[PDB]
């Protein structure tokens, strides 16, 4: 099952960086959302969620048919809380129509990440919606409440090696779990982009507790959370290591989460040889905007 990338008719750099500056605009301008968090840290899990549907054996789900706009999908619990990043982006897809959903949802995601002062993401056009029957079923992203050998197992379907999962799950830095949407909460209300999560992991006093949902989750008295699956990355010795460098390399992390991110959000897409390369978006800050 081949998903082939397909420009959107006559659009180019200019056009898609309209698009980021639309949806920088209004990050910058809704920013009282979730206790004045903003919308980034939902954009970024929108992002993922859309793309961590993906499986490398058929080339079933991931973010090229922009499937999370369908019922199924939208409403896998899996993804409760995401509705608001669909409602923030809805807009957005009002004043381009031209872009495909799989390309709205990605680059809300890289959009999220630059303008929270995260690494630049390369990202290219040309997902196209593909229809209702092709959305994947509930069931793919992956649970909070186990270990590391879970966590390593789960990522081997969305072609992640260890040190692009660790990487990947940086992105814990940003935002907090709702206990209303997964059973966790907590986790402060962070919004620029840095290594922290692996400082945290390394240097907090973290207490297993459960929490009102019933739920284990590890807790700080300094009022920081991590999941069970996010503690495993300092249970296991492979991921400790990896945890360890990225504590202790802001711009390494930064290099290694945006391939893995690129790559994640690229997952199932065959790109043609004469396809545009990446582009790499100025934030607003650097268009002085
Ligand atoms: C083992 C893998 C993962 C698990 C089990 C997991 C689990 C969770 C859970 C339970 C939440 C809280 C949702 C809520 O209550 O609103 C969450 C939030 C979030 N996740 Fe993950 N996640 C994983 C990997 C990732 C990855 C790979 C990314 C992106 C690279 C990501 C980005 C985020 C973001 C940014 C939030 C905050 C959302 C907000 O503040 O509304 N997660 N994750
Ligand atoms: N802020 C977070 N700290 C640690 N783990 C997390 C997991 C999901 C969302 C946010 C966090």
């Not at 040190?163 to 919004?191: C, D, F, I, P, Q």
Request: charged letters at 25%; proline letters at 5%.
């Amino acid at each position: 099952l081949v998903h082939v990338a397909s420009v959107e008719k006559g659009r180019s750099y200019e056009d898609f960086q309209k698009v980021y500056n639309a949806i920088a605009l209004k990050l910058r301008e809704d920013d009282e959302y979730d206790n004045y968090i903003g919308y980034g840290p939902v954009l970024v899990r929108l992002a993922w969620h859309i793309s961590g549907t993906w499986d490398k054996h058929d080339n079933t789900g991931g973010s090229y048919g922009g499937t999370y706009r369908f019922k199924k999908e939208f409403n896998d619990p899996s993804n409760a809380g995401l509705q608001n990043g669909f409602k923030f982006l809805e807009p957005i897809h009002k004043e381009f129509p031209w872009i495909s959903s799989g390309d709205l949802f990605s680059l809300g995601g890289v959009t999220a990440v630059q303008e929270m002062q995260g690494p630049k993401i390369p990202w290219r056009c040309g997902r196209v919606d593909t229809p209702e029957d092709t959305t994947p079923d509930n069931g793919r992203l992956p649970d909070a409440d186990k270990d590391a050998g879970y966590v390593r197992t789960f990522f081997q379907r969305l072609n992640m090696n260890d040190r692009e999962v660790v990487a990947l799950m940086g992105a814990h830095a940003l935002g907090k779990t709702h206990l209303k949407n997964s059973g966790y909460e907590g986790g402060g209300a962070n919004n620029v982009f840095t290594n922290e999560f692996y400082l945290n992991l390394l240097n907090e006093d973290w207490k297993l507790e459960k929490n009102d949902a019933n739920n284990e989750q590890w807790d700080s008295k300094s009022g920081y959370m991590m999941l069970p699956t996010d503690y495993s990355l300092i249970q296991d010795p492979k991921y400790l290591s990896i945890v360890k460098e990225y504590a202790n390399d802001q711009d390494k992390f930064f290099k290694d989460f945006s391939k893995a991110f690129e790559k994640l959000l690229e997952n199932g897409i065959t790109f043609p040889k004469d396809a545009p390369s990446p582009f790499i978006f100025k934030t607003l800050e650097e268009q002085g905007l």
